[PDB]
Design a protein around this ligand. Sequence first.
Ligand SMILES: O=C(O)C(=O)Cc1c[nH]c2ccccc12
Length: 308
Amino acid sequence: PVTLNYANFPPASTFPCIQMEQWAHEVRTRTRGKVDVLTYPGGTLLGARNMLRGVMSGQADIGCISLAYHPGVFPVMSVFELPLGFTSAEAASSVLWELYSGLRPAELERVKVLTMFTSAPSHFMTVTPVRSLRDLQGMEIRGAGTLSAILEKLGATPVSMPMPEVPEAVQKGIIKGLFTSLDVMKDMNFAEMTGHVTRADQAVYPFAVIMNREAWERLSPDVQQVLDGLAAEHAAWTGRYLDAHVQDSMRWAEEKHGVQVHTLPEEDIAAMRRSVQPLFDAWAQRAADKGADPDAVMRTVDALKAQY
Ligand SMILES: O=C(O)C(=O)Cc1c[nH]c2ccccc12
């Protein structure tokens, strides 16, 4: 029997940790006890920033990274931080894993990628109501990576930070809100901090579950095929869990904490779409600057969405 240490950064209650536990359960079951997983939620082994380097140095065997936390590092897979039209985490997660699987971009060659998944679409959670784009102007809102770039295009003031730092930043007035999926209203108790939600139907945050190359290579071919054979099913499972849980989270937030929900006017939604359009070109240019083929990437994103 081998035991793999799986690091994660956010609290045990949140979806990246929930999925980690489910994955560990399946690994134990499907390897008939040959592989065990010892999990470290809440950043006790590796945190959000040192996750990638700590898995690569072998301080942990496995880890969970939010790609948006690593600017410049993932020129190809960062396409999934653009608004690609997904309305559910289940579809986005499945297409993300298929894109990685089909392109295997060099940016991730130095780790083994065990599976991938995404958050649900991003919305605004704020301390004061946002009923129009006018209300967002100059407002300090948390994002990361290209999600922060989206905020800047919309006229907000992005402040980038990893999820575990967000509650204090809101509590202490460093930011006025955050831009991400609504599961955190419950799972991190933002319902008691940000009493206003504005629909945005925006981009998702992509994640990878990564494994130290040497740890992976120390696994037998039969155990490898088991972990590989879990990857696609688990991507979908994670998105599916999250989709349902987002609805539960908002129900609890509205009913038990009086959260107010707002929608933007149609004209603001159209203007919002136009203002973020140039980020696609900027993504493509960075990708090409790094030797990748963004036309091919977008052709594959389009095909995989159509297949779905
Ligand atoms: O990766 C991020 O920081 C996100 O905003 C995506 C996300 C949505 N819900 C979460 C719960 C815990 C950690 C990250 C996220």
